[PDB]
Design a protein around this ligand. Structure first.
Ligand SMILES: *[C@@H]1O[C@H](CO)[C@@H](O[C@@H]2O[C@H](CO)[C@@H](O)[C@H](O)[C@H]2NC(C)=O)[C@H](O)[C@H]1NC(C)=O
Lengths: 49, 49
């Protein structure tokens, strides 16, 4: 549904558990290619894999 | 190094073990995006994940 508007910039605002699920979903879909930018809005950045 | 020749079609000819590692490496480097075509040269295609 986000692909209809051609939106490349995504901002993630969740805890240390949902961010891993979103990352795994992006990996399975294939959105981590050069041309995107994610923002993990949380106090911890290196906590997740 | 393969990206230098601008080659997108890759033919995989390995057992049921190396193909999984190659698929995992492709997933990690983000080459499974639309625009590539892989060929698994083996009798068992549904065997691997
Ligand atoms: C399947 O992957 C191949 C690899 O690019 C593509 O199929 C090509 O399909 C187009 C569309 O019919 C043809 O014009 C080409 O001749 C095909 N062969 C190539 C490009 O080598 C396509 O990206 C994918 N989908 C289909 C339906 O083939």
């Amino acid at each position: 549904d986000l692909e209809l508007k051609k939106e490349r910039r995504v901002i993630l605002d969740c805890e240390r558990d949902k961010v891993n699920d979103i990352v795994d979903q992006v990996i399975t879909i294939g959105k981590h290619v050069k041309g995107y930018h994610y923002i993990i809005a949380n106090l911890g950045f290196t906590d997740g894999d």
